[PDB]
Amino acid sequence: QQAGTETEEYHLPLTWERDGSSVSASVVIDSNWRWTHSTEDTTNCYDGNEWDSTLCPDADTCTENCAIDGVDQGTWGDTYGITASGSKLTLSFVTEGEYSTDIGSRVFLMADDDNYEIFNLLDKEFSFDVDASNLPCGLNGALYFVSMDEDGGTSKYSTNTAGAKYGTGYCDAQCPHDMKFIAGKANSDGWTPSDNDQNAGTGEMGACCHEMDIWEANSQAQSYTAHVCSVDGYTPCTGTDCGDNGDDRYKGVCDKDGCDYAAYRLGQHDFYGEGGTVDSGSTLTVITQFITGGGGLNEIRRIYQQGGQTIQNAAVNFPGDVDPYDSITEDFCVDIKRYFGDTNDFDAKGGMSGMSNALKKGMVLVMSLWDDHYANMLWLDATYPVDSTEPGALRGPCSTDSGDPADVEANFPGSTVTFSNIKIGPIQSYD
Ligand SMILES: [Mg+2]
Ligand SMILES: [Mg+2]
Ligand SMILES: [Mg+2]
């Protein structure tokens, strides 16, 4: 995409800490949350959930004709409900303006005005504080990493002149087709509007890359998950390579399910939630350690702190069925997927070694707040598939009727997540 000039671009300042030093950085809104309009005037190229077929008769003409515009200082709060102060960042769920309503947001941490910050997580400990207390069943306040290009694609894709400055180039291990710009081009060929998301659709291309989810959570359930792909960084896909939901789920280049460590799913129901061992009703500190052996990732450990207490991760609780792992390791992924009858696409795509090489190449930090128009977040917090009664179905305490976006947007529009005190440094010992 090219950049429009109706609105100035301002990245919202945010401080974090890198190896003991304060870093005055900023965040940028993902291009998919922006206005896409004609280069000639204010006509929308992307209008509701379909592209204008005069402006966008094919993807090449659409990319020539259409621009993504800026988010200025006032737009962060008034349009997206996003605020920051010091090292604290708050995302909102439903923000109503006079003329449009925003649902959630996704942002990336910047190194400077034109480049995302690149994190090399191997043999490091990454931590942050989160308040998930204002996230009901069906919402997900997420902090994660993805193998995006540092410049958002400007150097590789000549028709992307907007770049990381305008939050371009998102990809993840779902190979999402809902991205409006992929490989510097409008994804308007073969566009189908969503039947239940009035803002979203899907195009022929998907945007694939490795993904390390540090935190997917609401007040009721939480997981961390490693997703590896068999391709090198940001990779546009079409057709079977995208591994689309359904019959092709395990046939594409990325592991959509990932190797997940979800304490409630692993038989530890009282560990995290309202009044849990880790209490979701107040701020908590999430510590993640990327442990190496011979320079390669072999374990992803989790420690929590809250109220000055150090809380070790809850171990797998299936006595007689699965060993009491308490971290993501190769053996955990193999044994738990055998137990849950899940296809081990994590190993098929390269397993812990492939994941180690992804991390070695560097990843971009993402924070987002969203609801789920595909599966109502039931995979995170309820039972999924909804009528399944075998090991691995039960994910959290929420009803299988919870999380419909129409319901949560109507009933909990004031939901928010606050992330703070983002930190990277050497691996520490905890007791
Ligand atoms: Mg043409
Ligand atoms: Mg850097
Ligand atoms: Mg074609």
Side-chain angles (χ1 to χ4, degrees), residues 8-124:
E8 292 181 331
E9 182 63 12
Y10 177 75
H11 301 154
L12 182 64
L14 180 69
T15 293
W16 64 289
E17 179 191 325
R18 178 175 62 208
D19 305 323
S21 292
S22 187
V23 184
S24 291
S26 59
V27 293
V28 63
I29 290 282
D30 181 310
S31 66
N32 246 40
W33 270 255
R34 291 174 187 269
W35 175 29
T36 305
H37 63 74
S38 175
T39 54
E40 256 54 49
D41 60 26
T42 56
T43 300
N44 297 337
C45 281
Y46 183 81
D47 177 47
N49 65 358
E50 296 169 278
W51 297 86
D52 185 283
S53 62
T54 302
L55 279 161
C56 300
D58 63 52
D60 280 343
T61 299
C62 193
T63 307
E64 178 64 19
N65 290 342
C66 297
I68 55 175
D69 227 293
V71 170
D72 69 22
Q73 295 191 13
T75 299
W76 284 89
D78 276 14
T79 295
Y80 302 101
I82 301 169
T83 61
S85 158
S87 83
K88 300 183 51 96
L89 173 73
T90 295
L91 310 185
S92 287
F93 182 42
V94 175
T95 295
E96 282 169 12
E98 191 159 13
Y99 301 123
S100 61
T101 290
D102 170 77
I103 308 295
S105 53
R106 180 164 61 222
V107 300
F108 307 119
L109 185 78
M110 302 298 288
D112 62 26
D113 290 346
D114 288 286
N115 297 274
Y116 297 119
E117 190 57 70
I118 295 294
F119 288 79
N120 292 296
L121 293 159
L122 292 181
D123 189 37
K124 293 287 189 37

Side-chain angles (χ1 to χ4, degrees), residues 247-260:
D247 297 332
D248 287 355
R249 186 174 187 87
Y250 303 107
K251 297 184 178 188
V253 298
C254 287
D255 163 36
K256 281 186 160 58
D257 290 352
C259 179
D260 59 305

Side-chain angles (χ1 to χ4, degrees), residues 126-241:
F126 176 81
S127 63
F128 61 98
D129 289 347
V130 63
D131 182 353
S133 74
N134 200 28
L135 296 169
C137 299
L139 279 273
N140 185 344
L143 178 160
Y144 63 103
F145 293 95
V146 289
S147 295
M148 287 161 62
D149 291 334
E150 175 189 36
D151 64 7
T154 53
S155 59
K156 285 183 144 152
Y157 303 111
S158 52
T159 58
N160 180 359
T161 55
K165 183 183 264 182
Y166 285 76
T168 63
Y170 182 68
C171 54
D172 74 22
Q174 299 306 306
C175 292
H177 289 266
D178 71 350
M179 283 308 299
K180 285 181 267 198
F181 288 90
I182 294 177
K185 299 288 214 165
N187 190 25
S188 63
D189 286 338
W191 192 266
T192 308
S194 174
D195 292 297
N196 63 348
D197 188 336
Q198 71 180 90
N199 291 303
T202 50
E204 178 177 75
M205 295 187 283
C208 304
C209 63
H210 316 291
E211 178 179 0
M212 176 71 224
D213 296 315
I214 304 300
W215 185 251
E216 294 196 72
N218 52 45
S219 61
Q220 303 300 313
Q222 51 77 28
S223 59
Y224 66 107
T225 305
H227 299 253
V228 60
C229 307
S230 64
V231 290
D232 183 17
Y234 181 94
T235 299
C237 63
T238 59
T240 308
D241 287 336

Side-chain angles (χ1 to χ4, degrees), residues 325-342:
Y325 298 107
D326 72 347
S327 56
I328 291 180
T329 64
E330 189 58 65
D331 293 346
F332 162 77
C333 296
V334 170
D335 287 352
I336 198 78
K337 288 181 174 307
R338 185 188 294 127
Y339 183 54
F340 286 173
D342 291 344

Side-chain angles (χ1 to χ4, degrees), residues 122 210-212 224-229 255 258-261 288-301 325 327-334 337 344-360:
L122 292 181
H210 316 291
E211 178 179 0
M212 176 71 224
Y224 66 107
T225 305
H227 299 253
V228 60
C229 307
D255 163 36
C259 179
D260 59 305
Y261 194 102
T288 305
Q289 301 176 326
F290 295 85
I291 295 167
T292 55
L297 189 73
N298 66 16
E299 179 179 25
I300 310 171
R301 289 197 66 76
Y325 298 107
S327 56
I328 291 180
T329 64
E330 189 58 65
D331 293 346
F332 162 77
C333 296
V334 170
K337 288 181 174 307
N344 190 354
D345 211 28
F346 180 71
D347 277 330
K349 263 54 159 176
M352 296 289 283
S353 290
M355 195 73 198
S356 182
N357 295 334
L359 300 164
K360 190 168 202 188

